[PDB]
Amino acid sequence: MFAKATRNFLREVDADGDLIAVSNLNDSDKLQLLSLVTKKKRFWCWQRPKYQFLSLTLGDVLIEDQFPSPVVVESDFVKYEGKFANHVSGTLETALGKVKLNLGGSSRVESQSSFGTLRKQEVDLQQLIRDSAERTINLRNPVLQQVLEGRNEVLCVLTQKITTMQKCVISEHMQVEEKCGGIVGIQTKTVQVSATEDGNVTKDSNVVLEIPAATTIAYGVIELYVKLDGQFEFCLLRGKQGGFE
Amino acid sequence: MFAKATRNFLREVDADGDLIAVSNLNDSDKLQLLSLVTKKKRFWCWQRPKYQFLSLTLGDVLIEDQFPSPVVVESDFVKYEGKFANHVSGTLETALGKVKLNLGGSSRVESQSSFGTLRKQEVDLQQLIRDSAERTINLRNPVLQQVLEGRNEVLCVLTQKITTMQKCVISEHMQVEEKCGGIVGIQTKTVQVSATEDGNVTKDSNVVLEIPAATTIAYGVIELYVKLDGQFEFCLLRGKQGGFE
Amino acid sequence: MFAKATRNFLREVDADGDLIAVSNLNDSDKLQLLSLVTKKKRFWCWQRPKYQFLSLTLGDVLIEDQFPSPVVVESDFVKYEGKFANHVSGTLETALGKVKLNLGGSSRVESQSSFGTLRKQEVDLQQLIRDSAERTINLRNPVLQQVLEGRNEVLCVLTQKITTMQKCVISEHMQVEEKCGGIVGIQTKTVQVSATEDGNVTKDSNVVLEIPAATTIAYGVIELYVKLDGQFEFCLLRGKQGGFE
Amino acid sequence: MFAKATRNFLREVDADGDLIAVSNLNDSDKLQLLSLVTKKKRFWCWQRPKYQFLSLTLGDVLIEDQFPSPVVVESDFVKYEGKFANHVSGTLETALGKVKLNLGGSSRVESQSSFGTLRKQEVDLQQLIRDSAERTINLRNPVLQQVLEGRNEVLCVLTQKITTMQKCVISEHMQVEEKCGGIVGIQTKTVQVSATEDGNVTKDSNVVLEIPAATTIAYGVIELYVKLDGQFEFCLLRGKQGGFE
């Protein structure tokens, strides 16, 4: 599965977590260099921030000043090869008075993630700061209003991107076995009762799916400092990028 | 079965659920780029929203202003291959006083979903917003009145579409075995009664059906913000697309 | 994994710890000669200082005076070869009254770190001091303000760099076996209870990933003495490089 | 490991300890003839003096008078060959009341230190004394202030250097086995407790790394008599080289 394949990848290559794995193939054709994304900070450290991509780009939202030509540099690294055989078995057995419950769930996932030569396309960070420090982004736009209403989510702009060049292989084997068993005995008045329910579910998903070249594997964004007064700056440090009123 | 085949597909490829699987072959010839659909929000998160397709398109309902030529871009990905062997067995045994009931139901489904090179045809999101932000859609139409009467369901427009290029194979094997047994004994006055009913049902459906090329596999829509005042905007974020009075 | 591969390397070659291992491949394309980095001194000796890289360089922040041409000298050493077979097994067994817990976790890591001829590119330390001792760095910059607000983290400039010339091999084998078992018995009033939960998790990650040439393996920085008055000096000794107000 | 390799070397060749082993490859490219180093005398005879190298040289700090041309003489000796198979096993077993602790640690190190023809490059001691006895070193420098603040550490100048001419071999085998076992039994009120923790760690580091030619293996310094009045003399005897106020 594509979601697990890039998650495991970025785990073993990106030790700092500054790159974000692409969720699905749907998102792999929307993420482009210097297009704007928004991460919702309402979620805590428990879950990943919710990332949503606007259809607009930087030049679509600057309006005030002209578009600075990008400095795209191509670097290849980590062609890699990943095999992941995960076995998870969890049995829950509960017995309270009348009701006895026996549950056994065995899940086996063997996700092979074979990738070719992966290339990185990073944009010049200095071009990113030059336009931002000046009055380049218009304050009011017909779109992005819903972003301000909801301070918690802030606009970001993509600057790093990892893209594959060779047809990739994701051979996913997912064997799921779940056994549910319930024995119920009720001591009713003048009625002897005996109810037993047994549920056995065995599911197999042998899915070998290929991945085309030029797909997006990972992307890094740096956040946009937004003050409703109208002052904006694309800053890469934790100091002032959270959004302010 | 076609409904299960694309459901499993989008499950393993579309991790975010922004794409919707096509229910049947009937719907596979109605879904086209930029045709309007309506999702009924009356259902909760428990069931999927009810999606119904209007025969009209955007240009059929704009009327006020001219049709913006689409930006259709073709991308292929996830040619894929899916094998799904699912075994479900559930036995219910109930005994209350006179009536004893033994039920055993075994269901086996082996649905192979082999697909060729699947291609995506997405329309320019920026063309979608340009006409919408202007007074382009007429307020009153002879059709779509039943949509307003029923606020809950809102109009949407298709923008993403996944289409196959090679004859696809869906080899579905559905073995269903259901055994029903009831022993009933009644202690009647001066009448000794003994009633037993046994019902054994064994059903097999070995159906291998092919799927032609150019069929619709998945489609993504972005919703239309409808205010009865007459202000409309095709917005891709959760902020203002629900429909208002 | 890249983080472990250079950590083990610098451990066996750099006995004094004056060089810092590169965390991930993400950072391997950002670290360049004489670019500025910042280490956060809030952490104690327990954890390594948090190193973050600014997009700007020395010439980007001097402004006051012209850029002194670097003295880059190339030296190769420690082509090296590292094999690391680490076995970690830890079992925790706890039993308190009603609840009995048995936990067994076995982790095996076999990380082979094969590297080619590694080359060092050091900049002339005397060029580093000449500009610094003079009024060469502007006091106020639109960027780096967040660094001053947070005295604890101080700006540093990279001066030593170890770079590989041959495609490197990092064959990582990570076998993780975790077994969790809990038997729970509760002496409830008129309710005899017996709850057992068994969780077996077996995870394997056979990942053989290659490393391209020209990647950054290690980098050494010397810190920048910052006084908010405006006096700056790139000093290599512990005396005055901590940052002052 | 390089630190152990030259330590063992100088132990068997340098019986008097007047030469100091190079800590790491990092320091092997910084140590040059007649460059200045500083040893911190705060540490007692228990630990070696802390040696730190200034980026400056003699001619960089003389200023007052001109640089006396060196008398470098090349002599080769002790091509040598060292094999070191060290086995260390230490088991600690402690039992106090409730807590019983069994610990067993076995460490095996087989460090082969094969070196080629090693050459010595000594500078004329008489050239060293001629400039020093005269007013040749300026009293105040922008650098070295932190050395005076901290009398304890004094400036020294390198005069002896041992350098290899052939690619050297350091085949290090480090097998580390550590077994930790703790049985804990607590006689709590109305709660019978039994906690057992077992930790087995097995680590192997089979590292065969080569060493290039021209690397620094050993270096000898003679200290600089520093009086804050301004009188300096490079003296080789214990009499007056400690630094004075």
H, E, C per residue of B54-70: EEEEHHHHHECCCCCCC
Verify whether the Cβ–Cβ distance C211 to A84 is below 8 Å: no
Chains A and C touch (3+ CB pairs under 8 A): yes
* CA atoms of D161 and B108, how far apart (whole Å): 81
User: How many degrees, rounded to 5, is the angle at CA A148 between CA A144 and CA A152?
Assistant: 120
Q: Which residue of D has its CA nearest to C18?
A: D26
Work out the number of other CB atoms within 10 angstroms of the CB of residue C157.
20
Chains near D, with 3+ CB pairs < 8 A?
A: C
Report how many helices (DSSP H) and strands (DSSP E) chain C contains, helices first.
Answer: 5, 12
Structure tokens at D32: 């040059």
* CA atoms of D42 and A116, how far apart (whole Å): 56
Work out the number of other CB atoms within 10 angstroms of the CB of residue C195.
17
User: How close are the terminal C-alpha atoms of chain B, in Å?
Assistant: 41
DSSP class of B132: H
The helix/strand/coil state of B234 is: strand
Give the gap in angstroms from C-alpha A208 to the nearest C-alpha of chain C. 19
Candidates B84, B78, B76; CA nearest to B13 is B78
User: How many degrees, rounded to 5, is the angle at CA B167 between CA B164 and CA B170?
Assistant: 95
Chains B and C touch (3+ CB pairs under 8 A): no
Q: Using CB atoms and an 8 Å cut-off, which of residues 147-166 of chain A contact chain B?
A: 147, 149-150
DSSP class of C227: B
What's the residue count for chain C? Answer: 245
The residue type found at A69 is S
* CA atoms of D53 and C237, how far apart (whole Å): 9
Give the gap in angstroms from C-alpha D202 to the nearest C-alpha of chain C. 5
Verify whether the Cβ–Cβ distance C196 to A13 is below 8 Å: no
Phi first, then psi, for residue C178 (nearest 5°) are: -130, 125
On chain D, the residues whose CB falls within 8 A of the CB of C82 are 205-207, 209
Verify whether the Cβ–Cβ distance A78 to C52 is below 8 Å: no
* CA atoms of C91 and C105, how far apart (whole Å): 6
Sequence-distant (6+) residues with CB within 8 A of A136 are: A62, A64, A65, A232
Chains B and D touch (3+ CB pairs under 8 A): no
Contact in structure between C78 and D211 (CB atoms under 8 Å): yes
Structure tokens at D223: 């200290």
* CA atoms of D51 and D35, how far apart (whole Å): 13
Chains near A, with 3+ CB pairs < 8 A?
A: B, C
Candidates C103, C82, C159; CA nearest to C126 is C159
* CA atoms of A111 and B12, how far apart (whole Å): 12
User: Are β-strands A20-21 and A216-226 bridged in parallel, bridged antiparallel, or unpaired?
Assistant: antiparallel
> In Å, how far from its chain's centre is CA C192?
54
* CA atoms of A151 and C95, how far apart (whole Å): 48
What's the residue count for chain A? Answer: 245
On chain B, the residues whose CB falls within 8 A of the CB of A150 are 239
What's the residue count for chain B? Answer: 245
Give how far Cα C88 sits from Cα of B169, C106, C177, D57, D199, Å: 48, 6, 10, 49, 8
* CA atoms of D197 and C94, how far apart (whole Å): 8
* CA atoms of A133 and D63, how far apart (whole Å): 46
Candidates A88, A125, A123; CA nearest to A104 is A88
Work out the number of other CB atoms within 10 angstroms of the CB of residue A184.
15
A75 in reach of chain C (CB within 8 A): yes
Verify whether the Cβ–Cβ distance A212 to B76 is below 8 Å: yes
Contact in structure between A28 and B120 (CB atoms under 8 Å): no
Nearest residue, CB atoms, A133 vs list C142, C172, C215? C142
* CA atoms of C30 and C24, how far apart (whole Å): 11
Give me the DSSP letters along B22-81.
---HHHHTT--TTEEEEEETTS-TTS--EEEEEEEEHHHHHBSS--PPP-EEEEEE----
Candidates B176, B22, B170, B21; CA nearest to B82 is B170
The residue type found at B182 is G
What's the residue count for chain D? Answer: 245
Q: What is the dihedral of CA B145, B146, B152, B155, to 10 degrees?
A: -60
Give the gap in angstroms from C-alpha A183 to the nearest C-alpha of chain C. 14
Give the gap in angstroms from C-alpha C16 to the nearest C-alpha of chain A. 24
How crowded is the C-beta side of A3, counted as CA atoms within 13 Å? Answer: 11
Verify whether the Cβ–Cβ distance C204 to A129 is below 8 Å: no
* CA atoms of A67 and A55, how far apart (whole Å): 17
Candidates D127, D137, D128; CA nearest to D227 is D137
Work out the number of other CB atoms within 10 angstroms of the CB of residue D163.
20
Give how far Cα D10 sits from Cα of A102, C13, D16, Å: 70, 18, 9
Structure tokens at B74: 């073709």
The residue type found at C216 is T
Method: cryo-EM
Contact in structure between A13 and A81 (CB atoms under 8 Å): no
Give how far Cα A77 sits from Cα of A25, A73, C21, C209, Å: 22, 13, 18, 10
Verify whether the Cβ–Cβ distance B16 to A23 is below 8 Å: yes
Structure tokens at A236: 């890469």
DSSP class of B19: S
A239 in reach of chain C (CB within 8 A): yes
Contact in structure between A77 and C25 (CB atoms under 8 Å): yes
Q: Look up tokens 């297009």; give the residue.
A: A35
User: Are β-strands C35-40 and A232-234 bridged in parallel, bridged antiparallel, or unpaired?
Assistant: unpaired
Q: Which residue of C has its CA nearest to A134?
A: C142
Selected residue of A75, A234, A237 to mutate for chain C interface (largest C Cβ count, 10 A): A237
C213 in reach of chain D (CB within 8 A): no
Task: Give kind and range of the element (H or E) at residue D66.
Answer: none
* CA atoms of C102 and C93, how far apart (whole Å): 5
Verify whether the Cβ–Cβ distance A209 to B12 is below 8 Å: yes
On chain A, the residues whose CB falls within 8 A of the CB of B87 are 200-203
Q: Look up tokens 């923008």; give the residue.
A: B159
DSSP bridge pairs for B90: A199, B105
On chain C, the residues whose CB falls within 8 A of the CB of A89 are 198-201
* CA atoms of D38 and D31, how far apart (whole Å): 12
Verify whether the Cβ–Cβ distance C209 to A126 is below 8 Å: no
Give the gap in angstroms from C-alpha C187 to the nearest C-alpha of chain D. 14
* CA atoms of A229 and A227, how far apart (whole Å): 5
On chain C, the residues whose CB falls within 8 A of the CB of A233 are 142
Structure tokens at B16: 């975010």
Verify whether the Cβ–Cβ distance D143 to C129 is below 8 Å: yes
* CA atoms of A156 and A236, how far apart (whole Å): 11
Contact in structure between A220 and A118 (CB atoms under 8 Å): no
Nearest residue, CB atoms, D26 vs list C14, C81, C85? C14
Residue A188 burial class via C-beta count within 10 angstroms: exposed 0-12, middle 13-18, buried 19 and up: exposed
Sign of the four-CA dihedral A139, A143, A149, A150: negative
D64 in reach of chain C (CB within 8 A): no
Work out the number of other CB atoms within 10 angstroms of the CB of residue D79.
14
Structure tokens at A33: 């260099």
Work out the number of other CB atoms within 10 angstroms of the CB of residue B53.
16
User: How close are the terminal C-alpha atoms of chain D, in Å?
Assistant: 41
Verify whether the Cβ–Cβ distance C201 to A16 is below 8 Å: no
C75 in reach of chain D (CB within 8 A): yes
C14 in reach of chain D (CB within 8 A): yes
Candidates D125, D141, D147; CA nearest to D37 is D147
Contact in structure between C53 and C34 (CB atoms under 8 Å): no
User: Chain A to chain C, count of Cβ pairs less than 8 Å apart?
Assistant: 128
Verify whether the Cβ–Cβ distance A199 to B89 is below 8 Å: yes
Sequence-distant (6+) residues with CB within 8 A of D40 are: D49, D50, D51, D52, D150, D152, D153
Structure tokens at D83: 């094999």
Structure tokens at A124: 């010049």
> In Å, how far from its chain's centre is CA B129?
26
Sequence-distant (6+) residues with CB within 8 A of D16 are: none
Q: Which residue of A has its CA nearest to C206?
A: A83
A72 in reach of chain C (CB within 8 A): no
* CA atoms of D49 and D37, how far apart (whole Å): 12
Would you put residue A34 in left (φ > 0), alpha (ψ -120 to 50) or beta?
A: left
Alpha helices in chain C (DSSP H): 2-13, 25-28, 58-62, 125-133, 145-148
E strand segments, chain D: 20-21, 35-40, 50-57, 72-77, 82-96, 99-114, 118-123, 153-164, 168-184, 195-211, 216-226, 232-234
> In Å, how far from its chain's centre is CA C152?
18
On chain C, the residues whose CB falls within 8 A of the CB of A125 are 55
* CA atoms of A61 and B106, how far apart (whole Å): 59
Q: A73-105 burial string, b = 16+ CB within 10 Å, else e?
A: eebebbbbbbbbbbbbbbbebbbeeeebbbbbe
Candidates C178, C217, C185, C182; CA nearest to C8 is C217
* CA atoms of B121 and B140, how far apart (whole Å): 31
Q: Look up tokens 């057995």; give the residue.
A: A93
Encode chain A in three state secondary structure: CHHHHHHHHHHHHCCCCCCEECCCHHHHCCCCCCEEEEEECCCCCCCCCEEEEEEEEHHHHHECCCCCCCCEEEEEECCCCEEEEEEEEEEEEEEECCEEEEEEEEEEEEEEEECCCEEEEEECHHHHHHHHHCCCECCCCCCCHHHHCCCCEEEEEEEEEEEECCCEEEEEEEEEEEEEEEEECCCCCCCCECEEEEEEEEEEEEEEEEECCCCEEEEEEEEEEEECCCCEEECCCCCCCCCEC
Report how many helices (DSSP H) and strands (DSSP E) chain B contains, helices first.
Answer: 5, 12
User: How close are the terminal C-alpha atoms of chain A, in Å?
Assistant: 41
* CA atoms of D185 and D182, how far apart (whole Å): 10
Residue C239 burial class via C-beta count within 10 angstroms: exposed 0-12, middle 13-18, buried 19 and up: middle
